[PDB]
């Protein structure tokens, strides 16, 4: 029986892995100076947390298992939608030994065009993208800022939303063809 405490329903960061938060061109500014300070104190001096966009992520894709825990899209007042080749490149960047994190918006109003995913979907698309053990963790209402972010960059109009947190793990199956042998 160890004393102290085991768990934590915040984050869960332990020194001496490097933290990372992508962002889109819609997230403030201020949000994200109190973001980092955030986890800043979890990392300490042995941590370091290194901002990246979503966009520049496909044009400066990163090294293998070069991080721990990739924050995606997790910052205050941000709507964008996700793909596989953006939910797969996380994949990478993440160890075969860490944790996810992703917070995806859901729909489920009857309209005549749709455009984002379910909730079901929602959490295979990490189980397909390259991920082991996916599963809702927890859900959060929308925010003043996001119901109107929606309709003022998009512009989606859409009333009926939800937000949805899903983690995903990364599994040990990767065998190619050719070790790497420098």
Same mark, same amino acid.
Not at 37 to 44: E, R, V
Not at 114 to 128: D, I, N, Q
């Given at each position: !029986?160890?004393?102290?405490?085991?768990?934590?329903? @915040?984050? !869960?960061?332990?020194?001496?892995?490097?933290?990372?938060?992508?962002? *889109?061109?819609?997230?403030? $500014?201020?949000?994200?100076?109190?973001?980092? @300070?955030?986890?800043?104190?979890?990392?300490?001096n042995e941590g370091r947390v290194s901002v990246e966009n979503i966009k520049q992520l496909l044009q400066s894709a990163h090294k293998?298992?070069?991080? @721990?825990? #990739?924050?995606? =899209?997790?910052?205050?007042?941000?709507?964008?939608?996700?793909?596989?080749? #953006?939910?797969?490149? #996380?994949?990478?960047?993440?160890?075969?030994? =860490?944790?996810?994190?992703? /917070?995806?918006?859901? +729909?489920?109003?009857? *309209?005549?065009?749709?455009?984002? /995913?379910? %909730?079901?979907?929602?959490?295979? %698309?990490?189980?397909?993208?390259?991920?082991?053990?996916? /599963?809702? &963790?927890?859900?959060?209402? &929308?925010?003043?800022? +996001?119901?109107?972010?929606?309709? +003022?960059?998009?512009?989606?109009?859409? *009333?009926?939303? &939800?937000? $949805?947190? #899903?983690? =995903?793990?990364?599994?040990?199956?990767?065998?190619?063809?050719?070790?790497?042998?420098?």
């Open positions: !029986g160890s004393s102290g405490s085991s768990g934590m329903a @915040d984050f !869960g960061i332990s020194a001496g892995q490097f933290v990372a938060v992508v962002w *889109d061109k819609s997230s403030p $500014v201020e949000a994200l100076k109190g973001l980092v @300070d955030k986890l800043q104190a979890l990392t300490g293998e298992s070069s991080f @721990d825990i #990739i924050l995606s =899209g997790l910052v205050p007042g941000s709507t964008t939608l996700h793909s596989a080749e #953006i939910l797969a490149e #996380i994949a990478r960047i993440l160890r075969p030994g =860490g944790c996810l994190f992703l /917070k995806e918006p859901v +729909e489920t109003a009857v *309209d005549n065009n749709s455009k984002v /995913k379910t %909730a079901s979907k929602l959490c295979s %698309a990490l189980t397909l993208s390259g991920l082991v053990e996916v /599963k809702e &963790l927890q859900r959060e209402p &929308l925010t003043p800022e +996001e119901v109107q972010s929606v309709r +003022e960059h998009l512009g989606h109009e859409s *009333d009926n939303l &939800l937000f $949805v947190q #899903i983690t =995903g793990k990364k599994p040990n199956f990767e065998v190619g063809s050719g070790p790497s042998s420098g």
